[PDB]
């Protein structure tokens, strides 16, 4: 092979096979008895036992592995579980000391990028998703309503991107360092904000929030011409959200609340 | 053979689509670490979706509007007036 993305010993191969296919008794036996087993050994694609177990929705194997203090790729495991919508595995990973005993979930993408702890790295070089994608942003992207609610209860929020013409020091430093990365990070944040799951679970008035967000995304589509299609897609997402909310009205009172914004101005 | 050729084009487009920062884009578009050798090769080989991808387009715009930071954000009328005064 041209690229070596990872030689594993027989014991390590057995452990990785057991974790990948949910051989819970074997995994437990190796964790309890093997003193020469590297719990962080990786497969041909650089995925350790935790990543393999999470990817295959092996909750019991994940729980067994989480009892190892030196277990690695905890943050990437949470991101993978969130992306696949494995709620119980997300609960188990969120009980890890790396999340419960820290403010990791309440860190903005800029704040989480401020320190180079490589907590969410899925290997020795880079992360599974974009570094600016937080667990709450990823949950919004994948429309995982239960995961979004869980992260909201923990204090996670999606920070609103600054204006495209904002002159603050952070925006100028990001534009002068990597304009493409700045644009991609803004798109990812707006994709999280435009998500119906985040819109419905984070805003006290989701209809008004989605209407304003749709207008802002349309304006950004006009401005950022290269990524126009992405911004139009997000704007259509917001419009679809408000249309669905109106579609679910049953009596006149709900219709008046949606159309007027409070309890015949027709402001909305 | 056309199906296989489209498969190769889809592969390079997907690889470019997965770029996250400027360094990865430069590696894909230039072939090493602004010659744009791979962009020129894609044009020669008619890999349209590779050069039309927004990841390649933004770098092309950066080279296109070099030393004109601010003129890029202006409207079409401003650019037309610029052409007129240049003439």
């Amino acid at each position: 092979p041209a690229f070596m993305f990872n030689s594993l010993t027989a014991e390590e191969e057995r452990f990785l096979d057991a974790a990948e296919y949910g051989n819970i008794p074997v995994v437990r036996k190796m964790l309890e008895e093997s003193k020469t087993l590297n719990v962080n050994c990786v497969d041909y694609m650089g995925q350790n036992a935790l990543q393999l177990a999470v990817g295959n929705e092996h909750l019991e194997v994940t729980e067994l592995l989480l009892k190892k203090e030196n277990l690695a790729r905890i943050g990437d495991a949470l991101l993978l579980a969130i992306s696949k919508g494995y709620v119980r595995i997300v609960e188990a990973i969120l009980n890890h000391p790396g999340f419960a005993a820290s403010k990791r979930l309440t860190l903005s993408p800029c704040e989480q990028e401020l320190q180079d702890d490589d907590f969410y790295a899925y290997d020795e070089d880079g992360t599974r998703f974009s570094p600016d994608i937080t667990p709450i942003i990823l949950a919004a992207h994948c429309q995982k309503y239960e995961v979004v609610h869980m992260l909201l209860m923990k204090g996670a929020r999606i920070e609103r991107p600054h204006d495209y013409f904002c002159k603050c020091g952070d925006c100028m430093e990001k534009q002068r360092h990597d304009s493409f990365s700045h644009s991609r990070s803004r798109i990812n944040a707006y994709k999280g904000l435009a998500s119906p799951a985040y819109l419905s679970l984070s805003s006290e008035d989701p209809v008004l929030t989605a209407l304003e967000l749709s207008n802002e995304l349309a304006k950004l589509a006009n401005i950022e011409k290269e990524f126009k299609n992405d911004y139009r897609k997000l704007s259509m997402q917001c419009k679809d959200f408000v249309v669905g909310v109106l579609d679910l009205c049953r009596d006149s009172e709900e219709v008046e609340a949606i159309l007027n914004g409070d309890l015949a101005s027709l402001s909305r | 053979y056309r199906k296989l050729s489209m498969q190769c084009k889809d592969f390079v487009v997907g690889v470019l689509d997965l770029c996250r920062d400027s360094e990865e884009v430069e590696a894909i578009l230039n072939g090493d670490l602004a010659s744009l050798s791979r962009v020129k090769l894609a044009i020669k080989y008619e890999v349209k979706k590779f050069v039309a991808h927004p990841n390649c387009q933004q770098q092309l715009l950066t080279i296109w509007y070099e030393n004109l930071s601010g003129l890029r954000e202006q409207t079409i009328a401003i650019k037309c007036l610029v052409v007129l005064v240049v003439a």
Binding site: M45, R128 | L18, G31
Partner: peptide, 29 residues
């Protein structure tokens, strides 16, 4: 040993392989 271009290409190809597997899992059953 490996150049910066080689490391970037390795990272991008690994990302492509994982992305391709994810999209394969998105195909209809």
């Amino acid at each position: 040993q490996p150049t910066r271009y080689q490391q970037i290409m390795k990272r991008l190809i690994k990302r492509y392989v994982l992305k391709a597997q994810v999209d394969k899992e998105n195909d209809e059953v």
